Amino acid sequence: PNFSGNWKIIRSENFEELLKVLGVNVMLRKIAVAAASKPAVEIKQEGDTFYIKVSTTVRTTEINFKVGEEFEEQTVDGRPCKSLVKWESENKMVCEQKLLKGEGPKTSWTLELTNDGELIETMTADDVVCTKVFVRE
Numbered sequence: 456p457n458f459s460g461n462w463k464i465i466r467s468e469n470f471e472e473l474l475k476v477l478g479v480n481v482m483l484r485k486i487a488v489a490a491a492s493k494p495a496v497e498i499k500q501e502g503d504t505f506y507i508k509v510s511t512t513v514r515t516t517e518i519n520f521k522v523g524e525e526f527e528e529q530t531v532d533g534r535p536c537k538s539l540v541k542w543e544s545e546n547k548m549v550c551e552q553k554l555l556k557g558e559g560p561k562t563s564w565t566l567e568l569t570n571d572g573e574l575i576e577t578m579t580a581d582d583v584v585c586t587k588v589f590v591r592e
């Protein structure tokens with residue numbers, strides 16, 4: 456699969472509820488939700504090696520990983536974690552996260568290239584899922 460692109464959002468669902476599970480208080484959630492409405496996602500892929508940059512007005516992240524090799528990043532609410540991405544299937548990667556310290560909801564994220572040329576991202580916290588869809592600019 457070729458995840459590479461400058462991806463523009465066309466749909467966002469359930470981010471506020473994700474943040475509620477993660478315990479983000481009401482006024483911070485309001486800020487986060489507004490900014491996360493227009494995120495820019497840049498992906499560069501070379502085989503099973505990836506770079507992903509996510510940009511919003513209130514948070515920008517960059518990660519580098521190889522599928523099947525543990526790495527460190529943060530949860531969406533900003534807690535450090537150890538992560539491991541696996542191919543769930545040919546066009547879909549799944550990242551399991553384990554907190555470095557403390558206890559919290561079980562979190563993960565996924566990226567899938569859909570047959571229409573678009574990209575589905577999910578983020579999960581326990582049972583609750585946020586779904587975003589993108590198309591290249």
Ligand SMILES: CC1=C(/C=C/C(C)=C/C=C/C(C)=C/C(=O)O)C(C)(C)CCC1
Nearest residue numbers: 483486487490491494509511513514532
């Ligand atoms: C949660 C949260 C915040 C905002 C986070 C945002 C805006 C995340 C966007 C993530 C995306 C957009 C990820 C992706 O799609 O890969 C701020 C900074 C207010 C601090 C309080 C907790």
